Amino acid sequence: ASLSLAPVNIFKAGADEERAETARLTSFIGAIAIGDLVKSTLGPKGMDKILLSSGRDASLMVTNDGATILKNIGVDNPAAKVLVDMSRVQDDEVGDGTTSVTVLAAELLREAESLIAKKIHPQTIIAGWREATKAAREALLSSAVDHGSDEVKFRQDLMNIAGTTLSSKLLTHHKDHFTKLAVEAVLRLKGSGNLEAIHIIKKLGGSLADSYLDEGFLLDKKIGVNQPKRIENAKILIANTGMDTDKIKIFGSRVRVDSTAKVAEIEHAEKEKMKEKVERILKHGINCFINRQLIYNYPEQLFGAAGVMAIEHADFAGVERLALVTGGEIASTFDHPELVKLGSCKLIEEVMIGEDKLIHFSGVALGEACTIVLRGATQQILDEAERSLHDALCVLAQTVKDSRTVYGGGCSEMLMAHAVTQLANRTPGKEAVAMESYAKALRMLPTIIADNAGYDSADLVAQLRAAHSEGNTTAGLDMREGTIGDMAILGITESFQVKRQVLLSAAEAAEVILRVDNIIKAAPR
Amino acid sequence: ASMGTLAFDEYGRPFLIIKDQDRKSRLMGLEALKSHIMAAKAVANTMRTSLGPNGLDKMMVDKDGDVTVTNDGATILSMMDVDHQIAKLMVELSKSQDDEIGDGTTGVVVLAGALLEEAEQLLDRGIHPIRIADGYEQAARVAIEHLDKISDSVLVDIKDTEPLIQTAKTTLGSKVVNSCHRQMAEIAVNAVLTVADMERRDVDFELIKVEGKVGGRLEDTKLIKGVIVDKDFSHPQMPKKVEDAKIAILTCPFEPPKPKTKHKLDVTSVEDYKALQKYEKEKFEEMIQQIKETGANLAICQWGFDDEANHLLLQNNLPAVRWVGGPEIELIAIATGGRIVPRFSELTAEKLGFAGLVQEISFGTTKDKMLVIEQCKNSRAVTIFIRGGNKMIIEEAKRSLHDALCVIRNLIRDNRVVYGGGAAEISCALAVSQEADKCPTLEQYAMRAFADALEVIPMALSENSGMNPIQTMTEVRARQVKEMNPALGIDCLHKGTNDMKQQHVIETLIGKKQQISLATQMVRMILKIDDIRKPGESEE
Amino acid sequence: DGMITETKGTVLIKTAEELMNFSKGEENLMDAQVKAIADTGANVVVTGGKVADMALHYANKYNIMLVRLNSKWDLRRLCKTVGATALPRLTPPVLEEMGHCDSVYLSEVGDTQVVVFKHEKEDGAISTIVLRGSTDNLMDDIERAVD
Amino acid sequence: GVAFKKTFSYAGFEMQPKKYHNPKIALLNVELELKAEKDNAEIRVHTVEDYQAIVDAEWNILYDKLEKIHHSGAKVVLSKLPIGDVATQYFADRDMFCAGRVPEE
Amino acid sequence: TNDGATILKQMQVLHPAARMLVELSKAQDIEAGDGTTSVVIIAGSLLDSCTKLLQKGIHPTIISESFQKALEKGIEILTDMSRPVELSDRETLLNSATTSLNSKVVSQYSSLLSPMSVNAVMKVIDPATATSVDLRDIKIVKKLGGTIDDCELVEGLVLTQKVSNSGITRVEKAKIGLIQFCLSAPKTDMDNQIVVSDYAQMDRVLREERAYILNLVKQIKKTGCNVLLIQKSILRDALSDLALHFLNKMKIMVIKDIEREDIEFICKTIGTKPVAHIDQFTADMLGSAELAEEVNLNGSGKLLKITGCASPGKTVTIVVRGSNKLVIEEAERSIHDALCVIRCLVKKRALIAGGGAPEIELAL
Amino acid sequence: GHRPVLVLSQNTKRESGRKVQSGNINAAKTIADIIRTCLGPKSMMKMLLDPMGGIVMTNDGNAILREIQVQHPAAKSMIEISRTQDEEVGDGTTSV
Amino acid sequence: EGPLSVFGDRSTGETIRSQNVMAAASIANIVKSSLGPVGLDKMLVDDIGDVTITNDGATILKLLEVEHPAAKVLCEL
Ligand SMILES: Nc1ncnc2c1ncn2[C@@H]1O[C@H](COP(=O)(O)OP(=O)(O)O)[C@@H](O)[C@H]1O
Ligand SMILES: Nc1ncnc2c1ncn2[C@@H]1O[C@H](COP(=O)(O)OP(=O)(O)O)[C@@H](O)[C@H]1O
């Protein structure tokens, strides 16, 4: 018998369970719903979604990113939760491929539902899918091309990858400008992978084509009252000291005297200590001083009298970015001026962006840190542009780390499906059917990509399959007109890491979901 | 059938005996026994589908909607939201099997359910449940003796780990991490063998750190003969890699000293203020100099430190890590061979730990940094780092690795093994059947019921793999009788042969003994209960 | 336990030496007090308040039996039946204030542990009746009959 | 003999040996931690030298207790009161075993 | 209100398209400052045409690219109709300001408001070599009562804070000083107490407190300062009664509770340099002003004005008056619209006709 | 559910023993005390308020007893014997 | 309720047997005080004040309201 359908009841109130058929039905329904929702936002001709929050603030979000779509949705189906977490982990690993991996997992689970309806034990499906995944991974690895040795070819590959990544997003309107921007921003990192060194500043107003990558750096902080607003040949000192009612860290210390004259003397001594600290800072021979913490009025006027800029309250990210872009050292003690390196830049001034004022660092020495100003017509446009630029930067950083690239436009999926079919044609049993379903899902990915553009997806997929079977391993979808073409010539390329991660994560999630034959829910809180 | 008694006296006066007796319920005798047997049968039938390599998983949802996909029987029953007392007994039996052995948490529940199912028919035939319990106990004694008889020994030596690898692979076969079967088994075996007291003593699990980070691939799970740390270097401009690091483990914050007793330092003049400021500055310089004098390259602190100490450490080419947890401090000290120092005044060269490589590791586009302290000389602590495509498979891999480590620990404690796949169950059932013939008639029924209940594991294994249960089990039993070979089981993987010795399906002997013992004791405890008094209040 | 000031007691430490020596001096003082109490020949100490850990340690060191009676009525009745005087300080008892008894021991009756002050003589200020029974109500009725 | 569950060991406990072939056991009712001397103790100083002396005096009190325990010849230390991490590491450095918050019974 | 951005953001619209249109109006206000209604109506008309375009069977991607092409052509046409303008031509500036104010409630007062706005913009920028206007350098002060005809263009600064030193007002040849410390009893950053164990000490405490306060006041006076502005202090008393009495007895105007955010504006206007410790309080850090007086607005309130400053800064203050609060808010919004129009004329100095001419030419 | 099981029906009271006898005798005594003062040539009259709104101002014991309503059945028996005495001989209703 | 699936209560064994004896004993105890020359009559009130003073056993059980079927057997007896 079963726990639910037993004369005696074994559960508390509100706790139930779903047996084999019911659990499989619910899991497949949830997975197919997630896949259908996330799809239609896939490929060059994919539309965006409106995420209207039901909360008190009612946040409005217009996005094309699949991970963000799946993140901000109330999900109660546990398999849908599995797919959502897959998408989030895929986003964490690499910037792109969230929609691709989610759709692939959904199609795999649809094929699994069909196979189960065809009276096939799920373990056979899992074994066949493991074999097919091995074959597809081997084929994709054998298909990778590396161009990191050649500088110009690697730069061209970076431009192609950035364009391919930005083709689906809202930035496809100015794809060329945004691709150049993203490639330059990534190349300025000099091999470092910290995207936190790249700051994206969203300023409302202006066309989306008004966005630009600043040649130096931009800071959104202020300057002291009596300090210069513009210096030339700056010698910058970046610090992390207090300089705000700075107390000696002996917490048990106190002033205990028997006259107010002594209190005044101690106050004067405190001010003298602050003045001595400011003098020690000035002994470094600096023009601009940047502190992570607050700067109070007395050190402010002390800097002003010396004609030294004092930018205050630049947070940890701010001081890290300034150190990266100028080459200075974040110092907290000033007893050894010769052990501290000072950042240098040609010009510091205040610029007027929108209705706000920012500090502009021009002619920086190192420059291994970028700021990108995004101009848009709506807040939603700015947010979506930032998300798209983040995706492009993530993919470009991954390509810089690992230079292996594969061709997009469904070419990789078609090659994987061809390899899987070749493997399945020489295997007895129903595992051959399982691998055929694997290939069907792999082919369904470019089928959905073509459907989103309104083309004859069936005919295009048949042509691509025939071309790949014949031997044309670089054939792919051409969305300029709606035909098939050479992805190498047309310059649609993707990072090998992204495609491999998509394939492996989709296979893993399909395998873990398929193994489930019973869903047991506790009483909700 | 409930509500206890209700008479209200034969004189018509009120008859109140037990507080709130009109809202309580009770069951007596055979009805209670049948209800217990039904509940246990339901639990066992639910659990039996998750048995063997072809066993399927259960998706468990807690109160907050969090989802765990698992095949571990103990976890499934622990997260399952039961109300029946016998179901709680089954859950506790599975937890007991997990605690003592670590594996076989699903077999015990199925065995107990089968035993109670046979006891149902025995009771229907008109046998006192105490007689059934005694027969079950003595049949279990016979089965345990047979298990000891048919056991085989293995080498737990470090030079040859192949039997250990096979045992770990057999343990991990039913889990989802079988896609990296041999790799996971080998890392588990190496982990257990590394952190173990050689002379058959205990394997201490606080020396094994299991960490799971999302991203990467499940194949990227690796064994680190050191410590993985969630922290990173304190100063952002500190170097990201130290070679031949001479660690300096400290539990003192790099701050001016502070007495624990309530205290007040009086400042009465300007000279006092100057002396206090000089004292603070000189304390910072002195602690940095004391750290540097030992020749250390890396400093590890537990309680964090402030800006002046951070910049002094950066300026003196001394990478440092702050806010390291106490267990992590202990693990680092054990692995690197250093000593935990409570203050800088006691820091010497001989208390410094040595690590071949200290590195900071990125995880893609996440900003999350973690620290690796590996390449130790004779590291007595080990760490397992698990990757995956989602957190759920990460948790499942964590519990599968725990199962493998527990199995290897059991092998270290006792090196005798028996061959699984239902071969041990079939041999025990045959031994019980031969013993029943010599026994007087009355206990024969109990012994035969015990044997038939033992035969459920091969039936479940065959049914889960798609084969016909009764035909396969009967054929295997006939083959075992025909040729003396207690290694013939259920070919779940369809490898062609039934000999589990050749197929390397290996289980710990003590695991099977504990399975049978715990199942028998719980079945007896349930069979001895003939009365329930629930509150029956339907409270909220 | 060592007595404390009634208004407010704070340990004002001004040097390291006083901080180091304070606990040692306090423990030495308590040990001296307990040894002075024991030097009078006393071997049973009955107190009406809590017992300090150090006091219990030093009493155990000198083989002294401790009884802690919370209720003042029991303390008064024990003083009547033994002949001792309830001293208000930890000073060693003078000869007249020291109580005497034929035997004091820890015993178990049924499942309850009791402390018995027993006189061998057929006399004394207070005599007790130990009532046994199979029910609390029965013993209460027997107590009413005794009254 | 006597057996009881392990009672919340602190950091540094895992370096203590877990087997002794003729140990001497120091049964104690002592809190071996850095703490205030008394709940009503107040320290009043007016010099940094006195501040350092007070800190060193607290450390010396704790280390004097630990050194007396070590020189008693015992190898296993049990206390009803908690035993801090400093004492645990001190005993680990001497190849000794410690356990705090042991139940009174 | 008549401002399109204000109307849109003041009412909750609850629809994603409407909220995006509100954001569009906000962005137009940020970049331009006027035309916030025209842009929204243009977007609505474009989508209304998109309705029939989609119904005709056109994918909503050909429409977007065709709209981009039309936008580029329209930008070319608008640039073709544009006429070069330089900031030296005051007539064009006045005409632009009047056109901006034509659609507001202050259309009748335009003859006073538009020259005021043009002068305010030109005061805070250099007419040559300027690329943007920081409107935060123009401070708008709203005082209830009177007539919009009573709006003023004071070239100094207006402080809403009252004068604590009652009895001394309208000091001429002011030597203003801005201090950021407190004129009260001594207090150190670390906690401090004074212990008294003798009556002589207990009297000496008050005697030395008085001496310290008197020394502070005398050192302030010795620099020649006669107007004192005190920054607002929360932890410690900014101005004690004894300090106020000493300052009053030495003929010094005292104004306390100056906000921390207004320090930059005050220093840019007067020219004072803030002082945080009495050691650095010298004569060179004082701002010289011709007059610093407090004026009453016909019983509707009191304002402090400092008119006439040696080396005046690039800041101006506009005082807005009105019968009730609503017309005052609308007058402030309209003046802001005029200032934004002049700012947009400062950068990309090109001019076009209005009255629907450029847009009907665009249509043709 | 599980409605309680009873031998006799609900709301079925039962008294027994000395209490019943004492209650019956006390009810009879109270009934007697009601009209004790209406006997003899010096008897005082009583005013009775009918539920129908009428007023019965009388000295006869039988009328007084029949114009009141009682719940104790012993009082009912007393009223019945008063009516019997009135019907049989015509007077002596207070005396009986 | 359980595997029987009957919309009603059930009692088996000594539970029902005691109830039947208790119900039968209740009827007897009603009329045990009205036996023999030293017996005493009973007073019955019919919920509307109708009084029935009787000593006959049948009359007492006729007017009583009995619910238990075992009691009804004795009352009809
Ligand atoms: N210009 C293009 N031509 C053909 N296919 C493209 C082009 N740009 C992107 N694609 C395809 O669209 C798919 C989805 O990319 P996108 O929607 O940008 O992100 P995600 O991979 O997260 O869905 C990719 O697999 C890629 O092959
Ligand atoms: N390769 C195999 N071939 C046949 N039987 C196996 C194999 N691996 C495991 N089994 C059987 O599957 C049963 C269930 O094991 P498992 O699910 O790993 O843990 P549990 O015993 O807790 O369910 C074991 O009793 C074992 O005999």
Ligand SMILES: [Mg+2]
């Ligand atoms: Mg993409």
Ligand SMILES: [Mg+2]
């Ligand atoms: Mg197992």
Ligand SMILES: [Mg+2]
């Ligand atoms: Mg306008």
Ligand SMILES: [Mg+2]
């Ligand atoms: Mg008469």
